[model samples]
Target: SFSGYLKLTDNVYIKNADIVEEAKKVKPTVVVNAANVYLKHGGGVAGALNKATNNAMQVESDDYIATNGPLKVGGSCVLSGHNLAKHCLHVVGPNVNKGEDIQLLKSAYENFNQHEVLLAPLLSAGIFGADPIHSLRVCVDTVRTNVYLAVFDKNLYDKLVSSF
Candidate 1:
């Protein structure tokens, strides 16, 4: 549950890992940081990136928000991963109750296609409360390149594995 590697295709791979320790295995071109519209680094993936980069990501993002205002849902912007990875891309994910939640989720993954070797956490399914398999299916259905899905907890991991 903690670690395993699957080469889903000649070019695609996925890790049963979190965006934290697990992601260090692949060192992808970009790590997707599931964020809020305001780009605040709170709980879940955002908080992990905050600590991983010694809070540098948040402060710089604070300024980005100050200037750019809230990022629209499914929009992405890049920031430093501070060696945790090459770079990190922030995507505003939808809360389950948000109308067109699945559409926004697909849009988030759509933006991620630009990175060939990408590591993405199982978004919305964690703190945001979208079902893991349901959310991951969207990722699987949409992702065209090498998108590595990162999962943190054993419980969710088990659920995701069983569901997927």
Candidate 2:
């Protein structure tokens, strides 16, 4: 079975699990991808999510960006896909050389305002090379609903457990 939840707000709960698998079971309203300004689903959580969603998520993201132009760093765009979740929220965090790392991530979480049940990745902490602890802290601080952060990384998961 899964570990118990770590409550944030009245509704927000941080839990560690296989994000894609958990989404298959829990079926959250949205699954958040730690994306890029270009909106390409290349690697890290974005790539994994794209693969899990049968490339539907990436196709939607590309279409959204083509219509609305590129999303700024620290910005977000939500899209409907054929994944378990009804929506996929793609939030552009600071890449190797972009905006303020922490603030950028905070904006990403804050931009995820519409959803109730959310599955979030550890933003900017994977291929983007950010501190996972700080990333989770920003996420916990910014989210307002029943957000489940899926920590697939063992090292980052340990850090997440020690964070609170």
Spell out the clash pairs found in candidate 2. Answer: none
lDDT of 1 by residue, 58-96 (tens): 998999899889888877888776667778888876767
* Clashes within 3 Å, all models in order: 0, 0
> What are the runs in model 2 whose C-alpha is more than 4 Å off?
1-3, 8-11, 97-101
Q: Which 10-residue window of candidate 2 scores lowest in summed lDDT?
A: 1-10
Model 2 Cα displacement at 26 (Å)?
Answer: 1.6
lDDT of 2 at 119: 79
lDDT of 2 by residue, 119-153 (tens): 78777887787787787778777777667778787
Worst 10 residues of 1 by lDDT: 1-10
Candidate of highest lDDT = 1
Q: Candidate 1: where are CA atoms >4 Å away?
A: 1-3, 8-12, 24-26, 97-100
